[PDB]
Amino acid sequence: SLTADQMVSALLDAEPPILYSEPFSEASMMGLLTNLADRELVHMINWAKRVPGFVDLTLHDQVHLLESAWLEILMIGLVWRSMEHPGKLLFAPNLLLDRNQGKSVEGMVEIFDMLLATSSRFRMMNLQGEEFVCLKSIILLNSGDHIHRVLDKITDTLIHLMAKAGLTLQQQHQRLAQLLLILSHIRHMSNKGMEHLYSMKSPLSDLLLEMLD
Amino acid sequence: ALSLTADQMVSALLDAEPPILYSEYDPTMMGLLTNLADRELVHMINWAKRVPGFVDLTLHDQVHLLESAWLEILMIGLVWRSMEHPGKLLFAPNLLLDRNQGKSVEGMVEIFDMLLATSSRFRMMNLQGEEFVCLKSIILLNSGVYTKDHIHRVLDKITDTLIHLMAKAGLTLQQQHQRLAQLLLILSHIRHMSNKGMEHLYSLSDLLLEMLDA
Numbered sequence A: 001s002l003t004a005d006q007m008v009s010a011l012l013d014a015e016p017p018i019l020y021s022e023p024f025s026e027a028s029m030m031g032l033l034t035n036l037a038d039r040e041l042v043h044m045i046n047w048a049k050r051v052p053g054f055v056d057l058t059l060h061d062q063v064h065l066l067e068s069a070w071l072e073i074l075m076i077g078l079v080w081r082s083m084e085h086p087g088k089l090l091f092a093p094n095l096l097l098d099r100n101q102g103k104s105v106e107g108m109v110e111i112f113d114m115l116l117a118t119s120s121r122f123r124m125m126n127l128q129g130e131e132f133v134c135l136k137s138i139i140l141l142n143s144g145d146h147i148h149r150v151l152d153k154i155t156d157t158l159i160h161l162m163a164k165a166g167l168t169l170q171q172q173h174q175r176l177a178q179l180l181l182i183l184s185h186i187r188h189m190s191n192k193g194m195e196h197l198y199s200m201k202s203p204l205s206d207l208l209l210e211m212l213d
Numbered sequence B: 001a002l003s004l005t006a007d008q009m010v011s012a013l014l015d016a017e018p019p020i021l022y023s024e025y026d027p028t029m030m031g032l033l034t035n036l037a038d039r040e041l042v043h044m045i046n047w048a049k050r051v052p053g054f055v056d057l058t059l060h061d062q063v064h065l066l067e068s069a070w071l072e073i074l075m076i077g078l079v080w081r082s083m084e085h086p087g088k089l090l091f092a093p094n095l096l097l098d099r100n101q102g103k104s105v106e107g108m109v110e111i112f113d114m115l116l117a118t119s120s121r122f123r124m125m126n127l128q129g130e131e132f133v134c135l136k137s138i139i140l141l142n143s144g145v146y147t148k149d150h151i152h153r154v155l156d157k158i159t160d161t162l163i164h165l166m167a168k169a170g171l172t173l174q175q176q177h178q179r180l181a182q183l184l185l186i187l188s189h190i191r192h193m194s195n196k197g198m199e200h201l202y203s204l205s206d207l208l209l210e211m212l213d214a
């Protein structure tokens, strides 16, 4: 219903805050991130409810979308924070880790490097905040009819941002392609992430349902 | 390679297309799929070498891109040929499985329904052959690009090719970048399905280097 520019403003206003973290072992480092993550998830839900077209979906669909996309969203949020910190990841203002410390957790050295590669790619493209919030909304809606019309609106919005940037048509859809292809790499990183979290001993749906309702 | 046109890009990719192989005739499942995939893999190497700008890369990079994308390439091919067979996957012309047949297969418990939905998606989008071969080429160059400027230059060109096909088809410019977005978002799902497959298979850098010595 809305215009390409008020879509930007609405999403920007719905942006979650940057939370603070609470040598490392494997269990203490994953304790830090899990905590930050679970705190971060509360704010993600409130953000999702303010993404245009989300609350119009059934509760069953809202939960399902967040359930499959939550790690993707945390990761692209992490990458966005670490953009101006080459060779490092900004989990929190009080938790900036280089590649060296990432070996505290086994199997995390691979995922770590994939996040750093994404961060450099965003810097190479000089990703804007107006585009970032658009990419993040797409992730929430795509990873899981009405949804596609909303997704089609975000595409127009992204194009609108690139057209106002002074870009000709060729560089516009080229950049659009470049951006969306990164999401495939983000999905990949999430998949490898779920594995590791599954490779651990023992409520998201409960948290999702509790806060969404 | 960077100086081709959209029509020359399409023409090169279409003639680079691998043949649809058959499952081994033996009247008297993962074994059949493994056998089929390994024979398909040999044709994939020949195809990849015909993808514009792929041979401009080093031998090491060619191996890396293929080891990262091979299952995605096989899966999108599976989805493509299963398009006009609703609610059923066409692994081979003589190996056609529907859902209940597929539910009883090793670890295809998750991806079968995903592959069908992807096939449903392409069908209701009316995916053209010219678009398909473009998407498959994109997969080849993009899957391992993060795990280099020439690669992104070829990708941008395949993007230019896709847009041209949509403009010629008679789509408005708004419909053009919308369709392009839809197609590329699907690649995320295909990446997702591949990961699910790789894991199950996990329970190479070798053989590729062997095949590409040709």
Ligand SMILES: CC/C(=C(\c1ccc(O)cc1)c1ccc(OCCN(C)C)cc1)c1ccccc1
Binding pocket: A030, A033, A034, A036, A037, A038, A040, A074, A075, A077, A078, A091, A108, A111, A115, A193, A194, A196, A197
């Ligand atoms: C890349 C770091 C990521 C963590 C992360 C945390 C916060 C953030 O903003 C971005 C990334 C991470 C760690 C743990 C985690 O668990 C939460 C779910 N619990 C309840 C099982 C989620 C993310 C991670 C994910 C899986 C394995 C290893 C690390």
Ligand SMILES: CC/C(=C(\c1ccc(O)cc1)c1ccc(OCCN(C)C)cc1)c1ccccc1
Binding pocket: B030, B033, B034, B036, B037, B038, B040, B074, B075, B077, B078, B091, B106, B107, B108, B111, B115, B197, B198, B200, B201
């Ligand atoms: C979706 C079916 C796919 C098979 C397949 C996909 C497309 C195609 O054109 C042909 C087959 C499949 C099965 C086995 C396989 O292994 C080959 C490599 N070996 C040497 C380990 C690859 C794909 C598969 C992958 C992992 C687990 C279960 C199934």
